Amino acid sequence: DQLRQEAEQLKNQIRDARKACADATLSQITNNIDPVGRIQMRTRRTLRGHLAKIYAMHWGTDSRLLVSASQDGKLIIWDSYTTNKVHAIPLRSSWVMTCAYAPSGNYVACGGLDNICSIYNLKTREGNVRVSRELAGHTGYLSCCRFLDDNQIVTSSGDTTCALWDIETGQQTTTFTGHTGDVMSLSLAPDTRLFVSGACDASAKLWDVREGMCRQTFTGHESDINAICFFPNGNAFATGSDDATCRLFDLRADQELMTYSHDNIICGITSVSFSKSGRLLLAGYDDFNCNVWDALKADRAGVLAGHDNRVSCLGVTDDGMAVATGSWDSFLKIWN
Amino acid sequence: SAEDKAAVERSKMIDRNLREDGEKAAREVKLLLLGAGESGKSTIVKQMKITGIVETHFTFKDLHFKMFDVGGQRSERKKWIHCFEGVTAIIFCVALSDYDLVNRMHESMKLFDSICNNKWFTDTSIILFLNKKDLFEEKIKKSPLTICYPEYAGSNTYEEAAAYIQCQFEDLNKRKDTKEIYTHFTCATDTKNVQFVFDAVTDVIIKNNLKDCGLF
């Protein structure tokens, strides 16, 4: 071990450096704020077009259309206001674990156990939906994909790799290495300049899209991280794992800020999201229901129990009017 | 609402093709193909008519068989083994000639008792094949079974050694009342593997019709 020793002391130095900036805790400051009371939300729409477990769901930027991906090899573009179906795209593989709707609205993305990201074009002549591109180059199942614009995309796979592609060519343009486990989640910043990915290392990272180097690394969980989300402000992020605990971090102090746990919760987290103002935290569980936490006081205020099987996805509209939950019983529910 | 009555008409035409496709895809047999590597899966897929995962489709006696090979998937099994829930059967390919090479059989039984006692495959039947048996006789006549099983107090013959190996595999399941383990001794020249699979899946289909019909 010629140089396998100073890493430990450097880790200790960063540990007690971030411990130095611990004048107070968020709990002490938040003790003076009034609680939100009781949160009561009810189902408004139910979408019934899937014949298998739902693994992915995404909102569009108009907060009306949403894309859903199931394990029966079908992408469905709903219309949440009228529960109509606009497009039913059949895929060449029925093993799908992610989906995403482009911000412009002219494309969708999909992927799964085929190790290939399929990008589909919705706005074209001939009146059909065509596979615009197929992106290959990864060595594992695809966990998450997010659009930056209509020509760029970020991918996270089980081969301990996140990549930044371009659509016209087909090539990657940057590869993010460092995770020792496999990435199961990914979330871009609101300004879309740096994204957070959390793998099975019980840890999360911060990457730089422009450069391609891991700026910061966050730890504190004791099991694989399944879900991650960025706070609306852009200087914090929530997460969830299998130890039934969520925790809100912050990019400025570079350490965990709060924890959200209960002594009647023993399952894992499958999805995490915020609200428009960042006051509520929506977490999906394996107990066939979802929980709503106060993001400042870490106290439960309500539950969303309407699914026969465990919820796999969970999203919130851009305008914050409603939230959508998709579970393993092939039913999407919109709560408002 | 003149152009919104056509929207409703479209959503009913495409909801009529999801139902037809669902009914067409519910009449098919689905078989996962597991097994430690270097085992004989490449031979088994060659026996029948015949990248992340590789699916294989073939027909036999007015039946449709889909076989999912998930081996070029080096990753954590816990993150994608719940996708294959509901598969009709699991085909496990274990070779008999790896009793001395490195200990391999041991790992094979570890894999077997990992998948067999899983939380998602509690009532999924396991067809077990042993394609390697031609040179197994030569290897067992040249070297005894004490390499892998020091507790084997038996003769050095194929008939007893194969059965002794078989009991260890059939004694790793903790559900003796919900799932069955069908066994076969496949050889390179044997063409009855399709028939064995068809009979096992026919019994599985009979048992499934029986739960769904609502009876015992």
């Epitope: 219309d79 109509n84 009146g127 | 003149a2 929207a7």
Partner: single-chain antibody, 233 residues
């Protein structure tokens, strides 16, 4: 995307005839289809509509009973069969495609037409007050259209369409729903309205926007066009 129609010619009055339109380049089975006729010296008039899957059929009075619309999806063909052909049924007939979902663009593509010669009150009346606006190149023009009933439905959408017919050619879609520009249209055209009066603005007029402009509604079953407005250099 191509739409070629055939049939018609010299037909004695009181006879029968059939027109056939063939499509090449788009999914014919996923598009509703319309037959629209135009008199030699008059505006466009909507004749018939057949929904995809052939589950919905509409016709217009002047032809109701004596005309039939059908489609052959495997052969990608549309048939119009007419009988008891009068002397008022001599016109040019165009085939139009239209697909309806959230955010679609109906009436996007028009055919070429087949010449043909045979020698109520609830419908909304669309009136274009002006009929000829001579404007020099490089000027801003405004064309006004009127409606008897408010086209603003109770969902946010108002159904009013602006087409353009250059001389010697078939109409083209410029604007749908009064505020959306069709694909392939320069950015110069604009549409405004308040539910009853609508305005089209051809800003920076160039050497192509010469022809007749028709304002169409799609709020209610029978579809009605305007009288037309001519633009001259």
């Amino acid at each position: 995307v191509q739409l070629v129609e055939s049939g018609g010619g010299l037909v004695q009055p009181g006879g029968s005839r059939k027109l056939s339109c063939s499509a090449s380049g788009f999914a014919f089975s996923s598009f509703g289809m319309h037959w629209v006729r135009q008199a030699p010296e008059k505006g466009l008039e909507w004749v018939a509509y057949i929904s995809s899957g052939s589950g919905t059929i509409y016709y217009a009075d002047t032809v109701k009973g004596r005309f039939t619309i059908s489609r052959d999806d495997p052969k990608n063909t549309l048939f119009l069969q007419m009988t008891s052909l009068r002397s008022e049924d001599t016109a040019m007939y165009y085939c139009v495609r239209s697909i309806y979902y959230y955010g679609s663009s109906p009436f996007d593509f028009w055919g070429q037409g087949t010449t043909l010669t045979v020698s109520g009150s609830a419908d909304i009346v669309m009136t274009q007050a002006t009929s000829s606006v001579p404007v020099t190149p490089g000027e801003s023009v405004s064309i006004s259209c009127r409606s008897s009933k408010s086209l603003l439905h109770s969902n946010g959408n108002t159904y009013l369409y602006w087409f353009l017919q250059r001389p010697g050619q078939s109409p083209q879609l410029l604007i749908y729903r009064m505020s959306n520009l069709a694909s392939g249209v320069p950015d110069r055209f604009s549409g405004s309205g308040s539910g009853t009066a609508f305005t089209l603005t051809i800003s920076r007029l160039e050497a192509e926007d010469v022809g007749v402009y028709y304002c169409m509604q799609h709020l209610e079953y029978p579809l009605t066009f305007g009288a037309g407005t001519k633009l001259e250099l």
